[PDB]
Amino acid sequence: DSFVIRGDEVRQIAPGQTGKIADYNYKLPDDFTGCVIAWNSNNLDSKVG
Amino acid sequence: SALGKLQDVVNQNAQALNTLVKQLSSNFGAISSVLNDILSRLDPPEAEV
Helix, strand or coil, X not given: XXXXXXXXXXXXXXXXXXXHHHHHCCCXXXXXXXXXXXXXXHHHHCCCC | CCCHHHHHHHHHHHHHXXXXXXXXXXXXXXXXXXXXXXXXXXXXXXXXX
16 A cells, blocks of 8 residues: 655554544554555655745 | 351352452453443553553
């Protein structure tokens, strides 16, 4: 699953965590057996203005 | 004090049952002895723990 989140909201997408992104955008099952892999895309995914 | 054996057996059984009922109301290190309040106060992971 790929999606572009804010830096402050990377912790939300963990198993058994709550927040706006967790409950309204992408919910992780509490029994999630996987890897949350995130990296910066400031050059690629930020545009002037 | 002639029917001591039967009375003692009855008292032991009643005491064991009462002890079990009282022990139902023991925290065992948890926040509360009632599960509904624990579910209400805590998020699903901590409440589950």
